[PDB]
Structure formats: structure tokens, C-alpha cells
Amino acid sequence: SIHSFSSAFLFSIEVQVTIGFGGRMVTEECPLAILILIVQNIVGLMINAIMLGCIF
Amino acid sequence: MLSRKGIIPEEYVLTRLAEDPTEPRYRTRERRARFVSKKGNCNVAHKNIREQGRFLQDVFTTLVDLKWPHTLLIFTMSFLCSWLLFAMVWWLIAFAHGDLAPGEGTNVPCVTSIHSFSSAFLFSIEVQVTIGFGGRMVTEECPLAILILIVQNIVGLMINAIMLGCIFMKTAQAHRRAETLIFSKHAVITLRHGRLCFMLRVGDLRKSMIISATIHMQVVRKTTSPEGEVVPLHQVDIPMENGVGGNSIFLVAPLIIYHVIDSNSPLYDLAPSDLHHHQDLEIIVILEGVVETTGITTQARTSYLADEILWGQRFVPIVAEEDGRYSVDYSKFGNTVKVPTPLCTARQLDEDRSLLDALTL
Amino acid sequence: ERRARFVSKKGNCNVAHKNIREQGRFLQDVFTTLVDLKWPHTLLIFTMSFLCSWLLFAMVWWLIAFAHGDLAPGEGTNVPCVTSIHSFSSAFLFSIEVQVTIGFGGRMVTEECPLAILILIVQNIVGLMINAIMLGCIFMKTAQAHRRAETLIFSKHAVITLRHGRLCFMLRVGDLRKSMIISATIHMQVVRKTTSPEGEVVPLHQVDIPMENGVGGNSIFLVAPLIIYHVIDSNSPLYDLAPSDLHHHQDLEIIVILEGVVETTGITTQARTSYLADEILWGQRFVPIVAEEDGRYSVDYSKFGNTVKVPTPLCTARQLDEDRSLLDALTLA
Amino acid sequence: ERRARFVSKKGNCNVAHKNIREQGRFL
Amino acid sequence: TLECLSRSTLLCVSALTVISYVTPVFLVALLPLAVVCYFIQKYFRVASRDLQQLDDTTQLPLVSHFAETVEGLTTIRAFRYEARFQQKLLEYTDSNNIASLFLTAANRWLEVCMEYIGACVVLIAAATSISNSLHRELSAGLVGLGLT
Amino acid sequence: WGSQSSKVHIHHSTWLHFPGHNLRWILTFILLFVLVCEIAEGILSDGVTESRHLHLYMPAGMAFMAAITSVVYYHNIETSNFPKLLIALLIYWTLAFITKTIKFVKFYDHAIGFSQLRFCLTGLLVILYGMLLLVEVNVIRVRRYIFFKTPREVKPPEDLQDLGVRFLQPFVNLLSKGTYWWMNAFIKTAHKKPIDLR
Amino acid sequence: RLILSSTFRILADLLGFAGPLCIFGIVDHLGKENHVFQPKTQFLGVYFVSSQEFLGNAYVLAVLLFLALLLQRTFLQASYYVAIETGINLRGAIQTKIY
Amino acid sequence: LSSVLHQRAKIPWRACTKYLSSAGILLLSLLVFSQLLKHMVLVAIDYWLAKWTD
Ligand SMILES: CCCCCCCCCCCCCCCCCC(=O)OC[C@H](COP(=O)(O)OC[C@H](N)C(=O)O)OC(=O)CCCCCCCCCCCCCCCCC
Ligand SMILES: CCCCCCCCCCCCCCCCCC(=O)OC[C@H](COP(=O)(O)OC[C@H](N)C(=O)O)OC(=O)CCCCCCCCCCCCCCCCC
Ligand SMILES: CCOc1cc(CC(=O)N[C@@H](CC(C)C)c2ccccc2N2CCCCC2)ccc1C(=O)O
Ligand SMILES: Nc1ncnc2c1ncn2[C@@H]1O[C@H](COP(=O)(O)OP(=O)(O)OP(=O)(O)O)[C@@H](O)[C@H]1O
Ligand SMILES: Nc1ncnc2c1ncn2[C@@H]1O[C@H](COP(=O)(O)OP(=O)(O)OP(=O)(O)O)[C@@H](O)[C@H]1O
Ligand SMILES: Nc1ncnc2c1ncn2[C@@H]1O[C@H](COP(=O)(O)OP(=O)(O)OP(=O)(O)O)[C@@H](O)[C@H]1O
Ligand SMILES: [K+]
């Protein structure tokens, strides 16, 4: 369910915000998407944690 | 094999009396060690530390201590090791139930959409990171899967909690602020109010005030007792000559810090020749006080060796007054204009002054 | 069964409290207790709190689905409220997916029965509250520096030696970690069943004892082992101790307290120890230990608590002072 | 008003630091 | 030592040229390994020179002490002072033994590291030669020379 | 590795080798060799099939990495006399042993026999794990930290207690005495500061 | 100590004789008419390699040679050091007894 | 500083004054070239052995 950069931008939202709807999945096919998924999850967690700390 | 070092085991004693190369003489000229370096960073190397496990038990001290690139390695590897281990478990259990065998039957799989270890790893991503893609569901089929889902959820929440704690205590560090306090490269001695004192200058750069500031001051010198008790580093405290009697200081402008050399001060027998390049002597200035924003106590370590102490100079007046508000010209921070002063010792000066006063009166 | 230390050698204040009219405040103070719990017990309460919340809300979801009847099998005769619910196990998985915000999707909440919306809102609020509370306990738990207290380390047994004429109760305290403990502060107390002319009895009296610092203050700066010596003058209550009166079961104890905020976290930490009379030695000296190799410094922690001897007069502090007073008077005359 | 207060009546330390050899301490 | 040094270094050059000729891929791995080999050789020289000179300067006083005691054996026993000279002898022998032990230990460190380099060369040469032989029908004979 | 970048303590620290240290290392090596052998079998067996058959060597491929990490983890805990931390490593051995023992007896179900290589390698690896587990519980038997009584720990040897013992050959982890790895840092000093009787 | 030195040396010599034997094995199977075939033995879904056949793939013999060279060229050095250390201790004891 | 660098010298100056003085242009051209020829024959004999076995 990737069609245009609108869809891709929505998908990045759903991963980093951890909304995770389900229409836009990551499959088993290309290992680079799983690599990017790990990178985005870790970067998202780091930024969320750092912004938490600054807010505290 | 091909060497001739074992063929001849004999020796000749005719050649001897070889010495005086003069090469090691230049090596002895190497500068001696400083107690604490200028930018803090105390230069003490502990030896024969018996670890006894007191350097792994306090794990969460270490995690905050480590540098950011190392902390991100631990961050990333903690999460990824957890993800991959639980992915292994999901793969194995969904394989034991047979859901991995393609076209097994109408038996309802205990986790849908598990058709690889790749999808198993993606499923671990979805569960632990709490992303929940609709493709990989957890069905009500086998009790072990629900147990493992509970365990992974609790472990993921615990790992997130731990990393949140360490990021909290690291984003409120202090060593990024200790370096923004400025001392002089060298300190000066000069008479104020007819009495000899050891001046110094310290200032702040960031606008953020430093609250409840505190300036300890110590002399580091090997010193013996009349009983022969030899102390290699016999630190001695020194009052800051602050009028109130406390050592606290309100640091906005670059202030002049000094200790009046009365009969108590251990510098009571210094001479301008007694503080030359290689003299064994060192002053420490511990500037404490919290950071106003984060409320984290800090230190600003610094030292002054003998070959940095300079006799008979006064700090250039740094503060001026602009049109509406004061001015601070930090370029004149450490400049010490020459000022003539008596070149005798503190004891000789005191005795001479007392004798002259007695004769006059 | 002979003498009980007030505090143990490595902290753990050894006074057994008793006969408390416990108002229940101790169990009413939950957050402090949770932070003081050992990690395995914290994990157990953590796990039991989450599991109870999950399973309680799972019971509610199953009960409402049962009331709406969608768990009774039906093909098209019903419009479900909470989809895919077809057993209690399904409701438990649903509670997991909502509270931990996993949202697997196959178990949706529809618009039909509004009590599901109310319970969804309550569960979201409760999960956020429980996550917030458990995060708070973990944050304060990881800020603990009770572990750090096991690197402020004192010498095993301190000695009484002369220095510059008079007599001081020395000691040696050092640091093992690499960090620097800010605003360190050392107190030193003597413990004895002191009595008064009026007949007052104080079964364990504590008297503060000066650290004989030059500036006249408590604060100290601790990068290497130090010698914390209390100068015994006429004011001190060790002014009348005889070396013969320093046997094992003497009614004495020297509490030592070392404070100072940790720099990595910003937490204030004590460092306690005591020294019974047996653990006090007379007229001995601590061996100089801070060796200086060229280009650096060193500390030979092997000899951290290894002492040797030196001849000193075996007379009380008062006897020493009075005898030196008579000698000075004779010299003046 | 030709008089410069060192700190104003609301905290507000009324000093202007100048000629700081900045090393990125803002960032 | 000139003859043996020339023999050793030129046998090394002979061996390396033959390995490269038999298995041309080996030079791609020769460059990193040689650089690592270089560092070991460089560091060892700096150490070994010092230790060798130290060993020699240590042994000279030792024999001197022995000889001088043969002079004044009666004089040394006259003062009943021979406990001090026993401790002097033990110190001298300790210094000589520690110098020689470090020398032997540095010797063994160089040999272990250099023979590990040679073992890595063996694996690389064997893998490349076998791979080429099976895939490219390379002559078996050249494989034998490369290995030996 | 994070404390290591600021290990001035380990700059001149002290060590204490746990009992059965020699037998621990020689067993790790005697199983690293047969794990390389198992890897050779795995790469060799699948040469007849048109699928890679990862389940012949990747198990051993991670066993080799696991063993290396195990020995690294044991040396780290050996420098810092903190034995309570090896409980995880302890359970690993027994847990690993149990699983592989099942595989062994399963071959006995089908009458595989020593005539097949995998049975020989698996049997040898199983007895090696038994001996290694014996070592892991030997540590418990001596130091008794899990036992009821106080841990009967010993202090570091007085030979290394002295500051001036800079020839660490008698007491160094067995895989830094065959290859004289402790020499390496000293040689750096030789380049930096001349090696004299100091 | 000296017995340990000599035992390490003997095992180093034995293991060292692999090099020649491994070279013979590699070349012999790599020049055996240039015939390339599979193991040709199967058992219950996975091929089970036998004793000699594991010495078949010249890669295996070369890797085993590499391991043998590591063990040889570490045992041999261990033998050198033990003999050398005992020798340095014999000089110490003799140089004290003579004095 | 200066002591370290001077100590860290391989002394090719000494090797040059040693060899080139005595050997001149004849003995060196005999010694060195004989070594090169000897080792080239060693490589060649191994190579010929290989080709003959093949
Ligand atoms: C069901 C799944 C739940 C999910 C949990 C797994 C999640 C794993 C990721 C988290 C890894 C984090 C590791 C941190 C460990 C730190 C250990 C440490 O430094 O202290 C070890 C501690 C013991 O002292 P303390 O609690 O610190 O002392 C109290 C102090 N005053 C304080 O304020 O902190 O505590 C210990 O010594 C134990 C160390 C932790 C090791 C866990 C082993 C499990 C033991 C299970 C049996 C428990 C039996 C309990 C009996 C009573 C124990 C007192
Ligand atoms: C399945 C087949 C695989 C084939 C490969 C097998 C490899 C196995 C190697 C096993 C080595 C066996 C001997 C171990 C015993 C050592 C001797 C020993 O116990 O003494 C240790 C001594 C020092 O101790 P000490 O306290 O001063 O004296 C003893 C004490 N005083 C007493 O009472 O007596 O000091 C010593 O004597 C130490 C000797 C050091 C020896 C170093 C060599 C070890 C091998 C290194 C190999 C490197 C890598 C190999 C990888 C192989 C696979 C990849
Ligand atoms: C100071 C001498 O301490 C050592 C002692 C030894 C042990 C040893 O067998 N030596 C003699 C051998 C005998 C036959 C003279 C030798 C000397 C020169 C060149 C090679 C060799 N052989 C060595 C063994 C293999 C064949 C060639 C090794 C190395 C050293 C060392 O410098 O560290
Ligand atoms: N204006 C300034 N900005 C930043 N750091 C300063 C400033 N003035 C002094 N320092 C600090 O004081 C120390 C002295 O270093 P430096 O030699 O550059 O100055 P100096 O000799 O005191 O002369 P000056 O005050 O003219 O710069 C350094 O740690 C330096 O960072
Ligand atoms: N055992 C106790 N535990 C806790 N608090 C106590 C205890 N005894 C007294 N207090 C506290 O001391 C204060 C005195 O209150 P209260 O009059 O009830 O006691 P009291 O007169 O000291 O008792 P008692 O007659 O036992 O000495 C209160 O603040 C009470 O909470
Ligand atoms: N090298 C060291 N590294 C760290 N702490 C040390 C070291 N040596 C001693 N200590 C600690 O110093 C304190 C007293 O040590 P001291 O040397 O005086 O006696 P000890 O015989 O080592 O004592 P104990 O039996 O309690 O360990 C103890 O807390 C001890 O753990
Ligand atoms: K979520």
C-alpha cells in the first residue's frame, strides 16, 4: 500500500509515532526495508526519549 | 636453523668500562606531573584497584557515564538483541505448531502471517515497539504464544523504562557546563590593603546563573611533620578572605578571588624566587554551585603550578560602563599589568613592619 | 554476643527499631517503598500490577461481549460491537492490544454499543496512568546511588598518632571510581554512655568532632586517599583516653559520615562507617601511599590499610598536654 | 538616567558580556 | 650475520614471489598483511635493541662482583658483612635474569605473531590455489610449490 | 567496552583467576576445533542438494560465535572478581547441553551410528559440554557464593600485589601466555619511553 | 618444568608433520584425474558424510592444515619459553650456589 | 626529542661506508649478484620440478 509520497509520508508517520494501522505493512521480500524499519524505529525512540528529557 | 647465536657460547672480558652516554640526562628534564589539569580532568592514575565487582554492580552509573556514541551503541544493541531473541522464540513456536509448513491444512495457526523468520522478526518489531501491523495477528490457539506475548510486552516496557531513565540522567549532565567556566591561565601575587594576598580571576560565559556558588582553595605539597610523618599530598584548606566569613560568591562579572596571607595561611613563607619553574607547589580552586536550569550540582576544577604564579602583577580592570549597561571586555581577562611590590618573604615583611611600627610608636 | 556495633563497617545502620504505633503510613507511603524495594521484588510488583490490570480489563471486555451476545455463534444475525471476540482468551488478547497500545487490528471497536466506548476510554486512561506511575518508580530507582556508596571506602581500622606536637585520631578514606563527588562533607561522631553531674543518662551519646581542616569548615575535596584527622584539644571528649584504656570491650565508638552529591546523576549520598576500640590502634602511622611516577600520579591501594609503628608517649591526651605544659614552664623559667 | 544598575529590580542581571571567544557553547 | 641475514631476507623474497606467481590473488591480501607485519618488525626493533644492550650492561657488573670477592674474600669475611654482599649478588642476578626473561619473551612474541602471519598466508594461498585449480583447471603442480 | 575506554583503574589493576581456569580454556579450544569441523561437514554435506540446507552449519555457525563470546565473557568476569554475574553463562552451558543431548539420542533412534561423521562430532561436542558444565559448577563448589555460607573467596596473589612486578608471564589467561599478548602493550612503551632498569 | 617443555616440543613436532602430509592429501585428491562428484551417500533426508569422505574436499584439508599450523606454531613457542625459563632459573640457582 | 629520533636510526650511513669501501665495484658486484643468481636458481628449480611432475 505504497502509491505516492503522500502514502509514503503517512507510512512513516504510522511507524515512528507507532500508530501502525495495518494497510501499509512491511513484508519479507527486500531486506533493505527491514533495515530501514529498524533504523526508523531506533531513531524515533531516540528522538522521543530526548524530547521527553528536555520536557522534564 | 639459519642463525649463529647458539654456536659460540663463550665470552671475552677484555672490553669493559663503558658508560657515560649522556643520553638519559636529557630524559630527566621532562616536566613533572600536575595534580589537576587546567581544564579539570584530574591527572591521578589509580593503581592496584581490587575491583571485587564494584565496577559492574553500579551498572546505571556506568550507562550515564559513557559517551554518546557508546551510549547509542548500547541503546541500539539492547533493543535489537531483544527484538531478535524474541523473534527467534516466535519463529520456533510458530514452527512447532506447524504454521510454518506451507499448505498444512485448515488448522488455525497460533500466529497468522508467520511465513518465514523474516516475518517472525517483523512480528517482533510490531509487538515490542508496539506497532501492531494487522497482517500478523495473535490468535487464541496455543497458550504458549499468549504467555510469550505477555513476557515480551513486560520486557519491552521494562527496557523502554530503563532507557528512558538513562536518557533522562544523561540529558541533564554537567560536564557540558563545567567547561564554560573560565579561569586565568596564571595567577598573581600583590599587596592589597598593605597585606600580601594571592589573587586570581574567575568568570562565567553562559547567561544562566550559577546558584549557591562555592570556592574551595587548597595547596598541594609534600610536607613532613616534626614527628617524621611524611605526607606526599598534604592538602591544606585556605579561607577565601571573603568579608562575611563564608566562602560563597555571587558570580556575574569576572570577580577577583584572593586569600589574605595572614599568619595562618600556609603560603606564609613564599618568596619570588621560591616559586620558580620546577618548584614543588600547586594551588587548587574548586568552584562549586548548581546550574540554575537543571538544578544539577557542578564543579569547575583548575590548578596553578609554581611556574604559573607571577609576582607583583595586578589584573587589568575588565569592567567598563557602556551607555546604559555595564561592559565586560573578556579580552583583558587574564592580563596582569606590572605593579612594584616588596620582594621579601611574608614573614620577613611582617617582622619588619612590626619592628618599624614599634620603633615609630 | 559481646558488643554490638552501632553501624556496621560498610553502612547498614544496625539499630533495631521497636514498639512503633504504626499508623499504616509505611504502607501508605508506596512510592518511597517501591524505590527501596530490591530489583527482583520491583519486577514482581511491576509484573503483577500490569498483569492484574490486563486481566481485570480482559474480564470486563469479555463480560460486556457476553452481555451483547456476540460470543454466541451467529452468521449474519448480529452486528458485533467488539469484533473477533469469540472466547475469553480473545478478550484477554484484546485487553493486551488496547492497554499496551499494540493495536493488532483484527479486534476492532465499532460504533454499536456505547458502553464499549466508555470502557475503552477508561482503559486508555488507566493504562496511561499505570505506565506513568511505573515509569516514575523506575526513574527514581535508576537515580539511586546506593551502589555508588560502595566505592567511597575507608581504611579498615584507624590509628591515633602524633602530628605537630599534639595528638590526632587519623583515618584514611578514598575513592575507587573515576568520577568526582561534588561538595564532599565529612562528619565524625564519638559514641559513649555519657552521664552528667545532674544524673542524666544518655545510653548512646553522639558528639560532633572537628575534622581539623585549615579553613574551619566541613567541606573536603577527595581525588585520592586522604587522612581525616581530628585534632584532640581540651574541648574534645577523647581528651582523657589512655592507651591501656583502649582494650576491646571499651564503651566507645567513632561514627564517621562522608557526604557529597554524585556528579553523574546529582544525588546526595552518605558513606557510613564506625571504629570500635579494638579497631583503634595507638601510636601507629599510615604508610605514605601516593607514589608519583613521572608524567602522572599513582596510588598503591595494596597498602591502603597497611600501617607501621613509631614511638609515641603512652600517656593520655590530658597527661601529654599537662606534661608538656610543665616542661614549657620549666624551660621558660 | 546616567546610572547603570548591576542587577535590575526583577533579577535580570544587567551586564552585557563582550569579546567572548565563543566555541559553540550556544550549540 | 650478513650471510645469514641475506639468506633469510632473500628466501623470503623468493617465497613471496613464487606465491604471487602461483596465485595472483594473493597480492591483494599481501598488501594488508605486510603492512601489519611491518608494524611488528618496526616495534620489535625498537624494543629488542634496548633489551639487548640492557642485558649486556647488566652482566658486566655481575662478573665484576664475583672477581672482586676472590680478591678480598678474607677481607669481606673479616667484617662479618657478607649478608649485604649476598643481597647485592641476588639483586645483580635478579636484574640479569629479568633482562634475559624480557629478551626471551620479546623473542617469543615476535615469533608467535610472525608465524601467525605465515599461517594466515598458508590459508589464503591454499584457498586461492584450490579454488582456481578446481574452477579454472589450473595445473596441480603449481599448487604443490605454493603450499610447500 | 565502555568502561574500557576510561579504564585507568584497569591501567594497573589486579586479577584473580577462578579455579579450573586452565581446563576451562583448553576445553573451549578443544570444542572450537570440532565446531570448525562441524562447519566443514555442513558446507560439505549440502553439495548434493539444490537447497542450501542452512540447518547443517548455521547451528554450528552460531555455536562458534557463542563459544567465543562465552570465553570472552569468562575472561572479563575473571579480571573483575565478580563471580555472581556468570550465572547466565552457567545456565547457558547446561541449557545448551540439554538441547544437543536430545539431538544425540535422536540419531540413536534412527540407528545413525558413529559411521556417520555428524554422530561422531555431536558425541564429542556433548562430552565436551559435560566437562565444561563440570567446570562451571566447580566454580560454585569452591567459591560457594550461591551456597548458604559466606563466599570463601581468596585475595589476589601477593606476587602481583606489589606495584613493581612488570613481567606478567606466570599468571596470565592461558590464551595470552601461548601468544604472549600481555607483551604487546609493553612494546608500545618501548617505542614511547626507553626501556631501562626502571 | 623440563618434562613439560619436552612434551610440548614432541607434540609440536608431531603436529608439524601435518604440513607435508596435508600437502600430499590436497594435491592427490585435486589431481585424481580431475573428477568432480558429490558424496553419493544419503540417509533419511540429509546426506551423512563418512570418515574418509570428510578428508575429500581439499578445502577441508587446507583448513585443517591451517588449524594444525596454529597449534604447532603455538605449542612450539610454548616449549621454547618453558625450556628457556628453566634455563634462566638454572643460571640463577647456580650463580647463587657458586657464590 | 632529539635523543629519541637519533636513537631511532637504522644507520644506513654506516652500512654504506662499510660495504662500498671494501667491496668497491667488483666484490660487491660478485657477492650481491651471486646471491640473486642463487635464489633465482632456487625459484627456477622449484618451478621446473612442478612442470616436470605435471
Ligand atoms: C517476567 C518477565 C519480567 C521482565 C524482567 C526482565 C527484563 C530484563 C531487562 C532489564 C535488565 C536490567 C538489569 C538491571 C540489574 C541491576 C542489578 C543491580 O545493580 O542490583 C542487583 C539487585 C540487588 O540490589 P538492588 O535491588 O539494586 O538494591 C536495592 C537498592 N537499595 C535500590 O534502591 O535499588 O537485584 C538483583 O540482585 C537482581 C538483578 C536482576 C536480575 C534478574 C534475575 C531474576 C531473578 C528471579 C528470582 C527472584 C527471587 C527474589 C528473591 C529475593 C531477592 C531480594
Ligand atoms: C579436538 C582436537 C583439537 C586440537 C587442538 C588442541 C589444543 C589444545 C591445547 C591444550 C594445551 C594443554 C596444556 C594445558 C596445561 C598447561 C600447564 C599447566 O597447568 O601449567 C600452567 C603454567 C603456569 O602455572 P604455575 O602456577 O606457574 O605452575 C603450575 C603449579 N605451580 C603446579 O602446581 O603445577 O604455565 C604453563 O605451562 C602454560 C602453558 C601455555 C601453553 C599455551 C598453548 C595453548 C594452546 C594455544 C592455541 C592457540 C589457538 C588454537 C586454536 C585451535 C582451534 C581454533
Ligand atoms: C637466547 C636463546 O634462547 C632461545 C632458545 C631456543 C631453543 C633452541 O632450540 N635454540 C637453538 C637450537 C640448537 C640446535 C642450537 C637455535 C639457535 C639459533 C637459531 C636457531 C635455533 N633452533 C631453534 C629451535 C628450532 C630449530 C632452530 C629458541 C629461541 C631462543 C631465543 O632467542 O629467544
Ligand atoms: N575571552 C575568553 N573567552 C574564552 N575563554 C577565555 C577567555 N579569556 C580567557 N579564556 C580562557 O582562559 C585560559 C587562558 O588561555 P589563553 O592563553 O587563550 O588566555 P590568556 O593568556 O589568559 O589571555 P587573554 O585573557 O588575553 O585571552 C583558557 O582556558 C581560555 O579558554
Ligand atoms: N511509637 C511511636 N511511633 C510513632 N510515632 C510515635 C510513637 N510514640 C509517639 N509518637 C509520636 O509522638 C507524638 C506524641 O503523640 P502522643 O501524645 O500520641 O504520644 P506520646 O505522648 O509521645 O506517647 P507515650 O506516652 O507512648 O510516650 C505524635 O506525633 C506521635 O505520632
Ligand atoms: N586494592 C583495593 N582496592 C579497593 N578497595 C580496597 C583495596 N584494598 C583494600 N580495600 C578496601 O579497603 C578497606 C580496608 O582495607 P584494608 O587494606 O585496611 O584491609 P583488608 O585486610 O584488605 O580488609 P578486608 O578483609 O575487609 O578486605 C576495605 O573496605 C577493603 O575492601
Ligand atoms: K502504539
Interface contact F165, partner E, CB < 8 A: no
Q: Helix, strand or coil for residue C230? A: strand
Cell of B248: 560563597
Give the residue from B233, B168, F116, E2 showing the smallest Cα distance to H19.
E2
Tell me the CA distances in angstroms from C316 to C163, C227, C240, C241, C283, one per residue in order.
Answer: 15, 22, 6, 5, 12
With a 6 Å cutoff on the Cβ, whether B59 touches ligand 1 is yes
Integer Cα distance of B289 and B181 in angstroms: 12
Q: How far is A20 from chain C (nearest CA, A)?
A: 7
Region for residue C202 given its phi and psi (left: phi exceeds 0; alpha: psi -120 to 50; beta: otherwise): beta
CB distance G50 to G41 below 8 Å? yes
C47 lines ligand 1 (CB under 6 A): yes
Let me know: does B257 contact B216? Beta carbons within 8 Å. Answer: no
List the Cα angle E104/E110/E113 in 5-degree steps: 135
Residues in chain C: 333
Dist CA B64 CA C147 (whole Å): 14
Amino acid letter at C77?
A: T
Buried b / exposed e across E116-141, counting CB within 10 Å, b at 16+? beebbbbbbbbbbbbebbeeeebbbb
Phi, psi of C2, rounded to the nearest 5 degrees = -115, -55
Q: What's at C137, amino acid-wise? A: C
DSSP assigned state of C29: -
**Chain CA centroid to CA F183, Å:** 21
User: Within 10 A of A33 (CB to CB), how many other CB atoms are there?
Assistant: 13
Burial class (CB in 10 A: 0-12, 13-18, 19+), D1: exposed
- The resolution, in angstroms to one decimal, equals 3.9
C-alpha G78/C-alpha E40 separation (Å) is 20
- H helices of chain E, in order, are 2-22, 26-71, 73-78, 82-136, 140-147
User: According to DSSP H, which parts of chain B are helical?
Assistant: 23-27, 59-65, 68-96, 117-128, 143-171, 175-178, 346-360
- For residue C113, what is its C-alpha cell? 454499543
Q: Which of B4, B13, B18 sits opposite E63 (nearest CB)?
A: B13
In angstroms, rounded to a whole number, what is the distance separating the alpha carbons of residues B128 and B131?
8
C-alpha cell at position B61: 552509573
**DSSP character string of C34-99:** HHHS-HHHHHHHHHHHHHHHHHHHHHHHHHHHHHHTTTS--SSS---SBTT--SHHHHHHHHHHHH
Please tell me the distance in Å from H50's CA to the nearest CA on chain E: 5
Chain A: nearest CA to B168, how far in angstroms?
5
Dihedral pair phi/psi, residue C109, rounded to 5°: -110, 120
Secondary structure, 3-state, F117-140: HHHHHHHHHHHHHHHHHHHHHHHH
Is the CB of residue G83 below 6 angstroms from any atom belonging to ligand 2?
Answer: no
User: To 5 degrees, how large is the angle CA B12–CA B16–CA B21?
Assistant: 135
Amino acid at C305: G
Query: How far is B211 from B221, CA to CA, in rounded Å?
Result: 31
Q: Which residues surround ligand 7, an ion (CB under 5 A)?
A: A 18; B 130; C 101
Q: In this structure, what are the phi and psi dihedrals at residue E92, rounded to the nearest 5 degrees?
A: -65, -45
Q: Cell digits for B242?
A: 571573603
C-alpha count within 13 angstroms, C-beta hemisphere, residue B339: 16
- Give the DSSP H/E element, type plus range, for residue C272: strand C272-273
* Rounded Cα distance, B200 and B220, in Å: 17
Contact (Cβ atoms closer than 8 angstroms) between residue C124 and residue C100: no
Cα distances (Å, whole numbers) of residue B34 to B27, B28, B307, C294: 18, 16, 11, 10
Contacts of F159 in chain E (CB under 8 A): none
> Read out DSSP for A21-52?
-SSS---SS-HHHHHHHHHHHHHHHHHHHHHH
- C99 burial via Cβ count (<10 Å: 0-12, 13-18, 19+): buried
Strand partners, B192: B195
Which residues share a beta bridge with A10? none
- What DSSP designation does B187 have? -
| Probe residue for ligand 3, chosen from B2, B3, B5, B8 as the CB with the greatest number of ligand atoms within 8 Å | B5
SS3 call for F18: coil
Question: What CA–CA distances, in Å, run from F10 to C104, C179, C293, F80?
Answer: 50, 15, 17, 9
Angle at the Cα of B192 from the Cα atoms of B191 and B197, rounded to 5 degrees: 60
Nearest to B128 by CA among H3, E133, C96, D15: C96
What are the two backbone dihedrals, phi and then psi, of residue B16, each rounded to the nearest 5 degrees? -160, -170
Technique used to solve these coordinates: cryo-EM
B218 and B235 in contact (C-beta within 8 Å)? yes
Q: Which residue type is seen at F182?
A: W
Between the CA of F153 and the centroid of ligand 6 the distance, in Å, is 14
CB neighbours of residue G12 within 10 Å: 20
Cα separation, B76 vs A45, in Å, equals: 10
Tell me if B3 and E7 make a contact (CB, 8 A cut-off): no
Asked if B182 contacts B331 with a C-beta cutoff of 8 angstroms, the reply is: no
Task: State the CATH number of the domain containing residue B83.
Answer: 1.10.287.70
> Which stretches within chain F are classed as H helix?
21-45, 58-79, 87-109, 117-143, 158-161, 183-192
B144 vs E93: CA distance, rounded Å: 71
Residues B51-87: b if buried by 16+ CB within 10 A, e if exposed:
bbbbbebbebbbbbbbeeebbeebbbeebeebbeebb
For residues C72 and C78, give the distance between their C-alpha atoms in angstroms, rounded to a whole number.
10
| C212-218 own/partner pairs: CB under 8 Å, 24+ apart | C212/C168, C213/B237, C214/B236, C214/B237, C214/B238, C214/B264, C214/B266, C215/B216, C215/B237, C215/B238, C215/B239, C215/B247, C216/B237, C216/B239, C217/B237, C217/B247, C218/C185, C218/C186, C218/C187
Taking the CA atoms of residue C114, residue C117, residue C123 and residue C125 in that order, the dihedral angle to the nearest 10 degrees is -120
Q: Which domain holds residue B72?
A: 56-175
C-alpha cell at H38: 642463487
- Give which of C198, C273, C260 is closest to C223, Cα–Cα: C260
Distance CA B309, CA C230 (A): 32
Cβ proximity of H3 and F190 under 8 Å? no
Query: How does DSSP classify residue G58?
Result: H
Task: Specify whether the CB–CB gap between B214 and B287 falls below 8 A.
Answer: yes
* Cα separation, B281 vs B278, whole angstroms: 9
Spatial distance between the Cα atoms of B76 and B70, rounded to a whole number of angstroms: 10
Burial B284-321 (b: 16+ CB within 10 A, else e): bbbbbbbbeeeebbbbbbbbbbbebbbbbbbbeebeee
DSSP state of F61: H
Q: Residue C300 is nearest to which of F6, F8, F163, comparing CB atoms? A: F163
> Residues of chain F whose C-beta is under 8 A from some C-beta in C?
6, 8-9, 12, 161-163
Which secondary-structure segment (H or E) carries C190? strand C182-192
- Could you identify the residue written with the cell 591480501? E29
DSSP assignment string, B251-285? -SS-EEP-EE--TTSTTTT--TTTT-TT-S-EEEE
Q: Ligand 5 centroid vs C35 CA: distance in angstroms? A: 27
> Atom 15 of ligand 5 has which residue's CA nearest to it?
C21
Long-range interactions of E11-19: CB distance < 8 A, separation 24+: E11/H39, E11/H42, E13/H39, E14/H39, E14/H42, E14/H43, E17/H43, E18/E145, E18/E146, E18/H43, E18/H46, E18/H47, E19/E121, E19/E125, E19/E146
Residue A30 near residue A55 (C-beta atoms within 8 A): no
User: Smallest Cβ distance to B51: which of F82, F155, F161?
Assistant: F82
- Residue B229 burial (CB count, 10 A): 19
Q: Could you tell me which residues come within 8 angstroms of residue B11 by beta carbon, excluding any fewer than 6 positions away? A: none
Cβ-based burial of E98 (10 A; exposed 0-12, middle 13-18, buried ≥19)? middle
Bridge partners (DSSP) of residue C175 are C152
Decide: C17 in ligand 5 pocket, CB within 6 A.
Answer: no
Torsion of CA E54, E55, E58, E64, to 10 degrees: -140
Query: Are E and B close enough to touch, i.e. 3+ CB pairs under 8 angstroms?
Result: yes
Tell which of B27, B28, B41, B46 to mutate to test the F interface (max F CBs under 10 Å): B46
A27 is in an annotated binding site: no
Nearest of B15, B21, B38, B6 to residue B307 by alpha carbon = B38
